[PDB]
Amino acid sequence: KQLSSKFGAISSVLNDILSRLDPPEAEVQIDRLITGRLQSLQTYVTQQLI
Amino acid sequence: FELLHAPATVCGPKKSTNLVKNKCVNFNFNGLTGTGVLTESNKKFLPFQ
Amino acid sequence: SVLYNFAPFFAFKCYGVSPTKLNDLCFTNVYADSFVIRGNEVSQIAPGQT
Numbered sequence: 001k002q003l004s005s006k007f008g009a010i011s012s013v014l015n016d017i018l019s020r021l022d023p024p025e026a027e028v029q030i031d032r033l034i035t036g037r038l039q040s041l042q043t044y045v046t047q048q049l050i
Numbered sequence: 051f052e053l054l055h056a057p058a059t060v061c062g063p064k065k066s067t068n069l070v071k072n073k074c075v076n077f078n079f080n081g082l083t084g085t086g087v088l089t090e091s092n093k094k095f096l097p098f099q
Numbered sequence: 100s101v102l103y104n105f106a107p108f109f110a111f112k113c114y115g116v117s118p119t120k121l122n123d124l125c126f127t128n129v130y131a132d133s134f135v136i137r138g139n140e141v142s143q144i145a146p147g148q149t
Contacts, residue, residue: 010115011053015083020124022117051116051126061125080125 007036053081109141 006012009032011020017029058080074087111118142148 016081019083020116020120022119025117051129053126054128056127058125058127060127060129062122064122078123 002037002040005036007032009033009036114146 004012009029011017014033017026021029061080069088071088074085076083076085116124136144
């Protein structure tokens with residue numbers, strides 16, 4: 001369910017971001033999406049380990 | 051502009067292309083860009099969706 | 100493709116979408132507003148400026 005969260009970015013669908021913006025802004029948008037989903041995955045892996 | 055989930059009524063100039071079935075391709079249906087196979091569905095829609 | 104033939108643009112800065120990928124999007128209900136300003140406040144027509 002975390003896939004549909006914007007994480008403060010413009011859109012949650014990645015293809016819309018890559019087909020809608022220039023790479024000068026797409027770089028920071030993907031930065032936001034990467035850090036949000038990476039934090040979520042870290043939390044899930046810690047829960048699975050416990 | 052606005053990107054509401056609605057029937058798009060103003061769109062850029064792009065020509066149509068014939069459908070392909072049972073081959074997984076990348077498509078573009080009114081700003082909905084996705085990659086997958088296309089086939090006839092068992093589902094049914096009300097005539098507004 | 101008819102916008103560039105009218106007049107040389109001053110800023111043409113864009114947010115949200117890029118002004119090169121406008122021939123691939125497909126959306127709803129554009130809004131057009133028109134007014135005239137005296138140059139120095141052209142930069143004031145922006146999200147969050149005083």
